[PDB]
Design a protein around this ligand. Sequence first.
Ligand SMILES: CC(C)CCC[C@@H](C)[C@H]1CC[C@H]2[C@@H]3CC=C4C[C@@H](O)CC[C@]4(C)[C@H]3CC[C@]12C
Ligand SMILES: CC(C)CCC[C@@H](C)[C@H]1CC[C@H]2[C@@H]3CC=C4C[C@@H](O)CC[C@]4(C)[C@H]3CC[C@]12C
Ligand SMILES: CC(C)CCC[C@@H](C)[C@H]1CC[C@H]2[C@@H]3CC=C4C[C@@H](O)CC[C@]4(C)[C@H]3CC[C@]12C
Ligand SMILES: CC(C)CCC[C@@H](C)[C@H]1CC[C@H]2[C@@H]3CC=C4C[C@@H](O)CC[C@]4(C)[C@H]3CC[C@]12C
Ligand SMILES: CC(C)CCC[C@@H](C)[C@H]1CC[C@H]2[C@@H]3CC=C4C[C@@H](O)CC[C@]4(C)[C@H]3CC[C@]12C
Ligand SMILES: CC(C)CCC[C@@H](C)[C@H]1CC[C@H]2[C@@H]3CC=C4C[C@@H](O)CC[C@]4(C)[C@H]3CC[C@]12C
Lengths: 205, 205, 205, 205, 205, 205
Amino acid sequence: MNWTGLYTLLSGVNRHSTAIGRVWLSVIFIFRIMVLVVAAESVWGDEKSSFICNTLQPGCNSVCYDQFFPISHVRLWSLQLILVSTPALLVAMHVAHQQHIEKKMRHKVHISGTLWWTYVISVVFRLLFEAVFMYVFYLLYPGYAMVRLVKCDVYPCPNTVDCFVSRPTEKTVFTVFMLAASGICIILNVAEVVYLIIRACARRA
Amino acid sequence: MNWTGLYTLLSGVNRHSTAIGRVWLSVIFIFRIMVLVVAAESVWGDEKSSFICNTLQPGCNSVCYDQFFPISHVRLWSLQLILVSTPALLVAMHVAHQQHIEKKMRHKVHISGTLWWTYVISVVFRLLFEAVFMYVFYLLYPGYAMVRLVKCDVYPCPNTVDCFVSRPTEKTVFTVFMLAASGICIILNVAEVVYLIIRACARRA
Amino acid sequence: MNWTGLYTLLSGVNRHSTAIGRVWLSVIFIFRIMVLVVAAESVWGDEKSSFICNTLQPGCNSVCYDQFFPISHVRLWSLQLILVSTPALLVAMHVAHQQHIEKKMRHKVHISGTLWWTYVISVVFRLLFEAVFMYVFYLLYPGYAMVRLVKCDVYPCPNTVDCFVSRPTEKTVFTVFMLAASGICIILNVAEVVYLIIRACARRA
Amino acid sequence: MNWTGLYTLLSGVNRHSTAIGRVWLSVIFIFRIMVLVVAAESVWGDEKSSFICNTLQPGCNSVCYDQFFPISHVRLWSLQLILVSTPALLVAMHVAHQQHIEKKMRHKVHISGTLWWTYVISVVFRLLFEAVFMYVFYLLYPGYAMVRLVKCDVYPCPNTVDCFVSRPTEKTVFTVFMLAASGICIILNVAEVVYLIIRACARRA
Amino acid sequence: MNWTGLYTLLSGVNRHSTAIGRVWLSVIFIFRIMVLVVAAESVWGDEKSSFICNTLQPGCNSVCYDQFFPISHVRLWSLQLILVSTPALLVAMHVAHQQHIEKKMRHKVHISGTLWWTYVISVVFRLLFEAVFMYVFYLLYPGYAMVRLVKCDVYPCPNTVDCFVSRPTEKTVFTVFMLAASGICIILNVAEVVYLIIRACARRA
Amino acid sequence: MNWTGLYTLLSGVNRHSTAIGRVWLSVIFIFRIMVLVVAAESVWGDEKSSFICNTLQPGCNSVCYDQFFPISHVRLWSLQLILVSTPALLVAMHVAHQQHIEKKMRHKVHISGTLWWTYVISVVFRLLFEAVFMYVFYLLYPGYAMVRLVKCDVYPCPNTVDCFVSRPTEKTVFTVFMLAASGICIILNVAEVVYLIIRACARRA
Ligand SMILES: CC(C)CCC[C@@H](C)[C@H]1CC[C@H]2[C@@H]3CC=C4C[C@@H](O)CC[C@]4(C)[C@H]3CC[C@]12C
Ligand SMILES: CC(C)CCC[C@@H](C)[C@H]1CC[C@H]2[C@@H]3CC=C4C[C@@H](O)CC[C@]4(C)[C@H]3CC[C@]12C
Ligand SMILES: CC(C)CCC[C@@H](C)[C@H]1CC[C@H]2[C@@H]3CC=C4C[C@@H](O)CC[C@]4(C)[C@H]3CC[C@]12C
Ligand SMILES: CC(C)CCC[C@@H](C)[C@H]1CC[C@H]2[C@@H]3CC=C4C[C@@H](O)CC[C@]4(C)[C@H]3CC[C@]12C
Ligand SMILES: CC(C)CCC[C@@H](C)[C@H]1CC[C@H]2[C@@H]3CC=C4C[C@@H](O)CC[C@]4(C)[C@H]3CC[C@]12C
Ligand SMILES: CC(C)CCC[C@@H](C)[C@H]1CC[C@H]2[C@@H]3CC=C4C[C@@H](O)CC[C@]4(C)[C@H]3CC[C@]12C
């Protein structure tokens, strides 16, 4: 597991990506993966059982947890990580496939231009996915701090029982870490698009 | 774990598959595997215990869960993934075996034609398996949204107790993701069959 | 993890096995392993706790589960998989050992004949093990469908309490899959024996 | 993970071991490891909780389980596997060390003789360990069949409550498998010692 | 997994780091990782359930644990390990990227100087992160010894119930180990900065 | 995973260690690791829950377990294994670093002498750590046999309730195994120091 291998794997063997994607984006992906793993394995553990309510009627706890947490934070970050990693996977497979096609046997200039457009559009899609997940996170959970207690009131629960959230401060810390990682990813993606466009326009002149 | 190795592994070292199977189908397989892993490990966890009913007679919960969920979604997707991956496995083993037979020592043209027919029939079988699992999913679970509560009524359960489903919205989200992945796989398989047939007929002329 | 490596590993580097064992038998072994893993990890989970009875006397549930399920299906398939995989392991080790002995330094014709007989006898033993496990499965569990409820009556259980089986339809589906895989393995083993004998007799003439 | 690598790893790169140790002993070790893994992971699971007694005084179940099962079967087989595998590990390390010493720079004949004696004594120790564990198994658990129920009577338990054993028939099956594997290992070890001594004496003449 | 590979991986292939970072810092990182793994897997296990209170009102235990342990020690050390490992990751990626850029085709002297400044600033950031986490640990948990029992008093808990901490002495031991590892890391980082600055100034003269 | 690789990895690529450390010490480390893994995974499982007391006041069990078992045996052996393995890790990193420094470009004689002193001092530290952990084990747990029942009397526990220890005989067996492994490690370390000193003094003459 040498460093050249890990760097090449995270780079995607893409000859158009600049140092922002080669170094900073890959590092932040590693950082976000590690934080997500820690949060998933420890903080949001059996989150169904951790979320407790002062009630005795069966099923009241389950409905309240679904009502106040339609999607748990880790699952949303898991989906976000998968979705934003998909265009990178597509670009890597495209590069590998083009290498294979070349290996079977100018047209190479056309291939390079196609790869350039593919990478730029992939970064734009990655930026859009990050922005969409950020907006979804804002829509589901206003603010950045985990709620401590909630006043649940739903059909299986009579008398408007109140429920408590396990590890609220710890979850707030990890929420800030994940949001910060996503925000910096957005900044880097915008920087890559601008840098590539500027360099391409300068080369055109 | 270089990208050439992963691309070759997912391709099956099949010289007749086009860029649709080399790139798009493999990527969607990776995407579907990751979503399934997340859903299996977190969303559909101890699904037997999550599905709860407001009753005290032992065994009522188990029978109700079996009555309304004959096959849980993850198991159906697990079987679907195994079944649709089987023809790809068969083609890969056929290619490896033909390479071995050649390595022991025109007939190679006949081998190439046999591989071509094998791949085309394998894609047709993969398409049929995807369609069958899609129809089974429609038959077992009408619609695309997880039911929130059900009115169970079976022998161990008196008085027609009602049961609640854990994480209904989250399960709906993953259901849509899995259905979308399966649908795009169907589209790509049809495209590969049409593309191969068109190219073969053009070559015949 | 290239395809040549996986194909060679499953083949056993046996120069007498035909395409049936190289391709079809190995694929079905992979398929059976995957289905067994899914069934073991999810379907037959904590099968002791899943099997429930409407009784309060401690130990009644344990005795009833032992009385109606002397050996759980997954353990039987696990033992079956180990036993039927053993002759393949023996042949692979024999081939490796013969290569080592040759590497230390006609007699090679005698070695080839010994390997031929070893492979044929190994396939016969594999067929016998499959048939024996099939008969044992028939003897323990008549039919192919998991029982839904049973009327247990044993010493710790008074009043002949009835017990329920968790996930009966899902277990039936996996039972059919495992039985089908075993049946096709039997067919392929018979085909290999017949094909080898026919080819050997033809070569004798 | 080629077959030559696995065969070499299990052989210990020992040039004095005959085909019995290269092939049959290694295969039985693999078989015993797999059966032990299955038994440990499934059959003897939370064996403390599975062993149940019809009593309410806390700690009675724990003392009864300790009183009738001083050492659980899997732990005894785990210790047996470790102990009988230790001399093989010692021989492998000795061979590697001798290769290293040779690599630093007849004396090689003396080295070969020392390796021969080391291997023979290691096999004798392996045979003794197998016999000792077999005798211990006989001493702790007379017979070969798991007891179904026991009549416990110890200080925390009043009124001589009776306890039940979970999965008795399944445990009996695995016990027979493990005992059979150990017995065949004893036979093979005796055969190796006799074969080596006979061949050495014949060479002396 | 040879020693040269592990040493190179932990070194980051950085040609400016001295023997302090190559040897001592990497060893302490390994030591800290192992201690953290042991503490996470065993000592701080289901820490939510281990922390118990003599009360019956649901949710009181959860709020008390959050009130006295806003962030559990393992999570804080996990975040600390990730944060202090990040600059090392950045330097490694920078070195790999510079090697790639060189591989595409004095400027190399400028590259070496940039790498030198990058490494020095990274060590300073690593030192600052260690100091910040040390101060946070002091702020959250005064002293170095785990509290045995606490007198919780919060809204869901009436009558000021008292709670007990599981494994206090064991947690104290691991706390001292982790604090000692962090302290020595601080000392080594300061030593590296001073050594590099002294050597650079001497070279300037 | 060839034997040369494993032997080299456990040796540390140290050219001054004799056959005692190359072969016997490495083997005993492997043996101790395996026994510790078995004990940790099975014997000392959820040791908090296994240790039970005949009481109903919450938290009494936790305090009693902490009072009679300040540090559980597996954690002590885990810390012991980490601590005694640390000097071996330091020597391996030193050798790798010296190889790297040599690779950058008599002084080699000075390097060899420094490595010799480093190894000797490391063995002395390893011996001291083993002796210290042995004394700590004696201090915490007099004797070698696990206590069966204890008479706990602490603040949360009224009336001096008695507690029982799960699997006392099994834990005694593993305790003897671990103590024996540590004792033989002490003997081998003393032998290595004496052998190296004797050989060095003889070479001086
Ligand atoms: C610059 C940054 C964003 C690059 C991100 C690249 C990441 C997302 C890529 C690089 C290598 C990829 C991995 C390569 C191989 C596998 C094995 C496969 O069986 C599951 C997916 C998995 C694990 C891939 C997931 C996506 C992955 C981790
Ligand atoms: C174009 C797409 C559909 C190709 C899909 C290829 C997938 C289904 C193939 C490619 C490599 C294959 C894997 C190769 C090796 C192994 C190891 C074996 O012990 C279990 C099965 C497993 C894990 C295979 C499962 C099927 C697999 C993942
Ligand atoms: C044609 C078909 C039936 C061939 C079947 C071959 C199977 C049964 C063989 C091929 C490779 C073998 C594996 C090779 C290596 C190991 C590692 C060892 O530590 C445990 C057993 C295990 C995992 C073997 C189990 C048996 C195995 C999986
Ligand atoms: C002929 C038969 C009896 C040979 C038996 C050889 C077995 C016992 C040997 C062969 C290879 C050995 C393994 C080689 C490497 C490791 C990694 C180490 O970190 C733990 C022990 C472990 C897993 C060894 C355990 C013992 C082992 C499995
Ligand atoms: C001198 C000391 C401080 C160097 C510390 C280097 C450590 C922090 C570096 C060296 C190798 C790195 C690992 C290399 C590869 C991977 C795989 C990736 O999928 C997750 C992160 C992970 C596991 C990295 C984490 C950070 C890591 C462990
Ligand atoms: C002669 C005897 C005492 C030598 C003992 C050497 C042992 C203690 C050394 C040899 C190889 C080392 C391992 C090499 C690589 C890694 C990976 C790292 O991410 C965690 C630590 C770990 C697992 C090391 C732990 C210490 C280790 C196991």
